[PDB]
Amino acid sequence: TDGGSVFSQLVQSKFITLGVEKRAKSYVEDFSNGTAGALCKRPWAVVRYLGI
Amino acid sequence: QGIVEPAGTAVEYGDHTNIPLTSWNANFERRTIVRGELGMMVGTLEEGRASAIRLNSAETKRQQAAIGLETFRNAIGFYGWQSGLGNRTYGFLNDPNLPAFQTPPS
Amino acid sequence: QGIVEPAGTAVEYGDHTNIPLTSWNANFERRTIVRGELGMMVGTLEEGRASAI
Amino acid sequence: MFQKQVYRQYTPGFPGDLIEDGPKRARPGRIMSLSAVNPAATATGPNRASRAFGYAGDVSALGEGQPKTIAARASEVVIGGANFFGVLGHPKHYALFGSAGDSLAPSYDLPDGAEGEFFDMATGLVVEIFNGAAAALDLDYGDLVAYVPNNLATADDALGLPAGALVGFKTGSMPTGLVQIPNARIVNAISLPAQSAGNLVAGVTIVQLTQ
């Protein structure tokens, strides 16, 4: 029922700004991201060679 | 994601013969989401001293935060994340259900 | 001339965990300038004889 | 785990599914946990489909006062059993119910207190068969079958076997401690490799003629 999609990459977000905290003589920033790896729905359509 | 997997086989015909039947069996597959983080911190005196060489310390550290996250994501695509421990993330070159390498003629 | 050489690595996310940080470290390189010289000398008699040819 | 190989034909069927149509008998029942067995169970296992079950008791009283209300006829069963009460089947009837490590995982197990369908007479039933004596065995068309009791002695159970697994055997030789299901035939030939303790081969799916 779905499409072919032999290979695909599952990505939730690429760049997230968590927040900034200011101190007396410095300040801190944070960042985050998320991913889920790769999916192989049809492994019978892939051929791989270790030699070259 | 899910699978269908039908089943069934035929026999020769007969008037009083029993009736063969068909069936199916559905399965499901799962993948896990992985999160990463990275931060930065700048001091007052170091920021002023770094400006003497026409270099912005705050901006330089900010860019490295984004690049480090992209290196993390890129590596996860090629190689799975803690697949040996039991995490179901997998990668381009580390998926267990793959045809496995062969050798070329030449 | 100057170099930048950034640094930094990422860790997994956590609500109450510590925050990793990044850094950088610069360096410089130098080159040396070299000068040379060359001159000439002309005599009174040799100048006249040179014009013969 | 996704299809990693393309075959010329599909599989004939799956264990617990009826494969031929004919005379048939089945009754409902409820499952007892093994812990409730009074003399304790020497052989243990999960409430897996395509395995024998044994009668436990009657739970139709449904009341505690002097006048009781018997509004239904019900029976309850145990996985091992010594009083045969059919074989669990028809996986399409039940639900996954989840697994200990994570839900959405393949499993034929069923939680305690659930309701299942147990077959006494069946023209064709695909089951998972086991082997005894830790030796290579060929079944052929017409051998017999037996199932492991709850109270099987540990001397007769050197190979770790489930509580209610089905074991096929030749007419001449049968393992020392087992209960034979009367009037059951192999129907479909099959070959099984050699076995060892802790490394029992699961066998191959096989058709059955329960009665």
CB B34 within 8 A of CB B89: yes
What distance in Å separates the CA atoms of residue D33 and residue D113, rounded to the nearest whole number? 8
Q: Which A-chain residues 4-43 have CB contacts (< 8 A) with chain B?
A: 7, 9-12, 14-15, 18, 25-41, 43
CB A28 within 8 A of CB B41: yes
Residue B62's identity, in one-letter code, is: R
With an 8 Å Cβ cutoff, are B7 and D12 in contact?
yes
What distance in Å separates the CA atoms of residue B77 and residue B97, rounded to the nearest whole number? 16
What distance in Å separates the CA atoms of residue A45 and residue D86, rounded to the nearest whole number? 44
Q: How many CB atoms lie within 10 A of CB A7?
A: 15
- How far apart are the two ends of chain C, measured CA to CA in Å? 55
The DSSP call for residue C47 is H
- Any chains having at least 3 CB pairs less than 8 A from chain D are A, B
| C-alpha to C-alpha distances, C50 to C41, C42, C45, C46, D172, nearest whole angstrom | 14, 11, 9, 6, 133
* Pairing relationship of beta strands D75-78 and D25-31 according to DSSP bridges: parallel
The DSSP call for residue B59 is H
The DSSP call for residue D29 is E
What distance in Å separates the CA atoms of residue D180 and residue D159, rounded to the nearest whole number? 19
What distance in Å separates the CA atoms of residue D118 and residue D26, rounded to the nearest whole number? 5
| Residue D85 in tokens | 């009460």
Nearest to D115 by CA among D97, D98, D101: D97
Distance of CA D73 to the CA centre of its chain: 23
Phi-psi region of D103 (alpha: psi -120 to 50; beta: other; left: phi over 0): beta
What distance in Å separates the CA atoms of residue B5 and residue B27, rounded to the nearest whole number? 8
What distance in Å separates the CA atoms of residue D197 and residue D199, rounded to the nearest whole number? 5
> Which residue has tokens 């499993």?
D107
The DSSP call for residue D48 is B
* Cα-based angle C23, C27, C30 (whole degrees, multiple of 5): 170
Nearest to D153 by CA among D136, D135, D178: D178
Query: Closest to C6 (Cβ–Cβ): which among B35, B36, B64?
Result: B64
Note the resolution in Å, 1 decimal.
4.0
What distance in Å separates the CA atoms of residue A42 and residue C17, rounded to the nearest whole number? 39
Rg (CA), chain A: 20
| Residue C1 in tokens | 């001339």
Residue B86's identity, in one-letter code, is: G
What distance in Å separates the CA atoms of residue A13 and residue A33, rounded to the nearest whole number? 5
Is chain B adjacent to chain A, meaning 3+ CB pairs within 8 angstroms?
A: yes
> Which residue has tokens 């020497």?
D42
With an 8 Å Cβ cutoff, are A47 and B99 in contact?
yes
- How far apart are the two ends of chain A, measured CA to CA in Å? 37
> Which residue has tokens 């001339």?
C1
| C-alpha to C-alpha distances, D149 to D30, D82, D122, D155, D157, nearest whole angstrom | 18, 6, 22, 13, 11
Query: Closest to B104 (Cβ–Cβ): which among A7, A31, A49?
Result: A49
CB D16 within 8 A of CB D90: yes
Give the DSSP letter string of D150-205.
Answer: TT--TTS--S---SS-EEEE-SS---SS-EEPTT-B--S--EE----TT------E
What distance in Å separates the CA atoms of residue D197 and residue D76, rounded to the nearest whole number? 32
The DSSP call for residue B33 is -
Burial string for D47-74 (b: 16+ CB within 10 Å, else e) reads bbbbbbbbbbeeeeeeeeeeeeeeeeeb
* Cα-based angle D40, D149, D51 (whole degrees, multiple of 5): 115
CB D88 within 8 A of CB D125: no
**Residue D9: closest C-alpha in chain B:** B9
Q: Which residues of C touch B38 (CB under 8 A)?
A: 8-11, 20, 22
Phi-psi region of B86 (alpha: psi -120 to 50; beta: other; left: phi over 0): left
Question: Alpha-carbon torsion D104, D107, D112, D118, what sign?
Answer: positive
CB B57 within 8 A of CB B42: yes
| C-alpha to C-alpha distances, B18 to B12, D23, D122, D206, nearest whole angstrom | 10, 10, 12, 17
Sheet holding D127-130, edge to edge: D179-180, D144-147, D166-169, D127-130, D205-206
Q: How many CB atoms lie within 10 A of CB C5?
A: 9
CB B49 within 8 A of CB B59: no
Q: Three-state DSSP class for C3?
A: strand
What distance in Å separates the CA atoms of residue B57 and residue B87, rounded to the nearest whole number? 38
With an 8 Å Cβ cutoff, are D3 and A44 in contact?
yes
| C-alpha to C-alpha distances, D15 to B7, B24, D160, D174, nearest whole angstrom | 12, 11, 21, 24
Nearest to C4 by CA among B68, B40, B63: B63
CB D118 within 8 A of CB D81: no
* Pairing relationship of beta strands C2-3 and B19-20 according to DSSP bridges: unpaired
Q: Which residues of B touch D18 (CB under 8 A)?
A: 21
Question: Alpha-carbon torsion C8, C10, C13, C16, what sign?
Answer: negative
Rg (CA), chain C: 34
What distance in Å separates the CA atoms of residue D190 and residue B88, rounded to the nearest whole number? 36
Give Cβ neighbours of residue B35 (< 8 Å, ≥ 6 apart). A32, A33, A34, C12, C13
| Residue D123 in tokens | 């023209």
